[PDB]
Design an enzyme around this catalytic site. Structure first.
Site, PDB file in Angstrom:
ATOM      1  N   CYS A 297      -1.379   6.639   1.561  1.00 37.24           N
ATOM      2  CA  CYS A 297      -1.229   6.296   2.945  1.00 37.24           C
ATOM      3  C   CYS A 297      -0.210   7.562   4.075  1.00 37.24           C
ATOM      4  O   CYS A 297      -0.551   7.566   4.880  1.00 37.24           O
ATOM      5  CB  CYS A 297      -0.712   5.145   2.859  1.00 37.24           C
ATOM      6  SG  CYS A 297       0.869   4.710   1.939  1.00 37.24           S
TER       7      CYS A 297
ATOM      8  N   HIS B 155      -5.779   4.196   8.201  1.00 34.29           N
ATOM      9  CA  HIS B 155      -4.709   4.297   6.707  1.00 34.29           C
ATOM     10  C   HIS B 155      -5.153   4.652   5.671  1.00 34.29           C
ATOM     11  O   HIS B 155      -7.398   4.349   5.561  1.00 34.29           O
ATOM     12  CB  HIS B 155      -3.881   3.197   6.832  1.00 34.29           C
ATOM     13  CG  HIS B 155      -4.805   2.105   5.954  1.00 34.29           C
ATOM     14  ND1 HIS B 155      -4.691   1.135   4.949  1.00 34.29           N
ATOM     15  CD2 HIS B 155      -5.374   1.444   7.044  1.00 34.29           C
ATOM     16  CE1 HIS B 155      -4.977   0.194   4.707  1.00 34.29           C
ATOM     17  NE2 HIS B 155      -5.714  -0.014   6.168  1.00 34.29           N
TER      18      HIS B 155
ATOM     19  N   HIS C  30       4.259   0.245   2.240  1.00 28.84           N
ATOM     20  CA  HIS C  30       2.305   1.116   2.997  1.00 28.84           C
ATOM     21  C   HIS C  30       2.455   1.971   4.157  1.00 28.84           C
ATOM     22  O   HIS C  30       3.419   0.956   4.968  1.00 28.84           O
ATOM     23  CB  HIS C  30       1.630  -0.253   2.689  1.00 28.84           C
ATOM     24  CG  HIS C  30      -0.296   0.846   2.345  1.00 28.84           C
ATOM     25  ND1 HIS C  30      -0.467   1.352   1.816  1.00 28.84           N
ATOM     26  CD2 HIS C  30      -0.375   0.916   4.004  1.00 28.84           C
ATOM     27  CE1 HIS C  30      -1.648   1.536   2.395  1.00 28.84           C
ATOM     28  NE2 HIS C  30      -1.553   1.515   3.336  1.00 28.84           N
TER      29      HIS C  30
END
EC number: 3.4.-.-
Length: 129
Positions: free
Chosen positions: A33, A96, A84
């Site tokens: 990410c 992402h 995240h």
């Protein structure tokens, strides 16, 4: 013909469509990410982004549903990494790197991400000289 944010985000994504999730080892054989958001902004917008989410979140100030920006960094509650991060493109959708399926575009309307969404943070400076 303006340098559109979402356009450049998707333009970058067009190169990483289908890459698997790998923490730290950012490459076409795997990227995470923070690695993906790093790549996107560093070579498209030319923004100085670090390597880990905990660092990324401190590059921009937080906002709410009302003050969400195109290209904003939305933080998710993920035990696998603690933090995240996804690139907010519009409404509830964001691009992402997903753990299994890889780099995709998810939605905050999805129950998993809806409860995951902790807060948002704009690393892009809205003001220009």
């Amino acid at each position: 013909m303006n340098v559109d944010v979402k356009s450049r985000i998707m333009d970058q994504y067009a190169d990483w469509k289908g890459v698997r999730y790998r923490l730290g080892g950012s490459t076409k054989k795997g990227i995470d990410c923070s690695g993906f958001v790093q790549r996107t902004f560093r070579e498209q917008f030319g923004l100085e982004l670090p390597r880990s989410t905990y660092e990324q979140q401190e590059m921009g100030k937080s906002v709410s549903r009302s003050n969400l920006r195109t290209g904003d960094l939305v933080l998710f509650r993920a035990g696998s990494t603690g933090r995240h991060v996804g690139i907010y493109i519009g409404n509830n959708q964001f691009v992402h790197a997903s753990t299994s399926s890889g780099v995709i575009i998810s939605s905050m309307n999805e129950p998993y991400w809806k409860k995951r969404y902790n807060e948002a943070r704009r690393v892009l400076s809205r003001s220009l000289e």
